[PDB]
Design a protein around this nucleic acid. Structure first.
Lengths: 75, 59
DNA sequence: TCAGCCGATTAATCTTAGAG
DNA sequence: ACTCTAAGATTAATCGGCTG
């Protein structure tokens, strides 16, 4: 990929890095909480973000991604 | 899981380089390539994600 | 409204089949 | 045969359209 005839937009840098892997415990719970209730209430949202030491956005994103993963395993 | 066949890759690269202007195939072209290469649409989709990034990080 | 949902993708990473 | 590379997969986190 050393020489692209041009630098098209997609080749540009999007996203105005870090990937905080989640501990086995954290993932085990979120999962645990998922089998229980696929969607989240502002309530459950906070209590969990609390319990597992994570921001609300992370719990929100975690469930959003888990739903798409559920969608694609079909099961 | 084993890697893709020398031919499947060729097929994918052909598409990729053939479209460097927008390497984002539609779910159809993806389904198309998928069957051509004898691999899932997910596998194609992953392949393109990885291909794009690894292309960029090497410009 | 406007925060959260979907969907596709980005980018960092995990795994480990294999090019060397 | 043996070893690191990188192919292929997984998943935080982002972009953006859209609605309840």
């Amino acid at each position: 990929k050393k020489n692209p005839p041009q630098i098209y937009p997609w080749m540009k840098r999007v996203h105005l890095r870090q990937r905080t892997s989640y501990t086995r415990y954290q993932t085990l719970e979120l999962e645990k909480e998922f089998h229980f209730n696929r969607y989240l209430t502002r309530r459950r949202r906070i209590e969990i973000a609390h319990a597992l030491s994570l921001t609300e956005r992370q719990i929100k994103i975690w469930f959003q991604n888990r739903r798409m993963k559920w969608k694609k395993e079909h099961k | 899981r084993r890697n893709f066949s020398k031919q499947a890759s060729e097929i994918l690269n052909e598409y990729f380089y053939s479209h460097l202007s927008n390497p984002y195939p539609s779910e159809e072209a993806k389904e198309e390539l998928a069957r051509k290469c004898g691999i899932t649409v997910s596998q194609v989709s992953n392949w393109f994600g990885n291909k794009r990034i690894r292309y960029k990080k090497n410009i």
